[PDB]
Amino acid sequence: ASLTEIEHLVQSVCKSYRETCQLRLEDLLRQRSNIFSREEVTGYQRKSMWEMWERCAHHLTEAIQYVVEFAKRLSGFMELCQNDQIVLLKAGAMEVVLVRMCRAYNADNRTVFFEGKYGGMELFRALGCSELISSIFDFSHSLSALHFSEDEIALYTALVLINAHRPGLQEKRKVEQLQYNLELAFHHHLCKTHRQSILAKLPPKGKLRSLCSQHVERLQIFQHLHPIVVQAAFPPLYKELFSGGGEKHKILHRLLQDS
């Protein structure tokens, strides 16, 4: 590409991200005083393990559905073959969601916007995956220290998704070229905004890989404890992405096929 084309990619990526945000940042900030009461927190903690897992899986599936739409609107993504579209989404959808989560996290009080209000990690105690929860909260806490702009989150999550190193890509070189153009767009934007200092502060990729592995692993523990709940009450797209073998369900291909 060249300078006009790079800036066009910058604006296109930021537009795609705005149109596929579940919640506007302003909406999330305005809600910061709306925190679960101690009695509402006690009620979450008295919910059964399987109901809290189902509710979190539903919450996560809705966020993932927006990431799929982001991908479809991302320059060049729909040009890739369907095998590679699916490889990239299966690998990076949750990674994007974990990054997007910092917008909904309040570092002042260590709360996250969940089911209409802000609550701390104690809200999730019924899940029985305390390590994963605090790992996710610590990750959001670290990202919040970066003070991402919406444009920065747009460009960075595009790169999280368009990763040419994902195992299973049939057209690796084509993904390499798309990745390179998006890197140019991200780094051009950082250069023009004097934000290149954030490059050193971005999490290593192995950290997002690790969080995703923990989630799958805790799911396997839960699935062993309540296999019928997973089969009957977990969202089909969630099972396709995370549960073994859940990927007999193909939701993604329909989400990609339908306009």
- Binding site residues, Na ion, CB under 5 A: 102, 105, 144
- Three-class HEC string of 66-106: HHHHHHHCCCCHHHCCHHHHHHHHHHHHHHHHHHHHHHHEE
Q: Which is nearer to Na ion, 87 or 102 (CB)?
A: 102
What is the distance in angstroms between the CA of the first residue and the CA of the last residue of the chain? Answer: 28
Least distance in Å: CB of 112 to Na ion? 9
Q: Which is nearer to Na ion, 101 or 237 (CB)?
A: 101
CB 118 within 8 A of CB 103: no
Q: Which is nearer to Na ion, 32 or 209 (CB)?
A: 32
Q: Which is nearer to Na ion, 102 or 190 (CB)?
A: 102
Q: Which is nearer to Na ion, 11 or 109 (CB)?
A: 109
Least distance in Å: CB of 207 to Na ion? 17
Least distance in Å: CB of 102 to Na ion? 5
| C-alpha to C-alpha distances, 176 to 67, 76, 196, nearest whole angstrom | 21, 12, 22
CB closest to Na ion, residue no: 144
Least distance in Å: CB of 96 to Na ion? 16
Six-digit token string for 91: 């690998």
Least distance in Å: CB of 227 to Na ion? 36
d(CA 257, CA 259): 6
Percent composition of the chain: helix, strand, coil (DSSP 3-state, to 5): 70, 5, 25
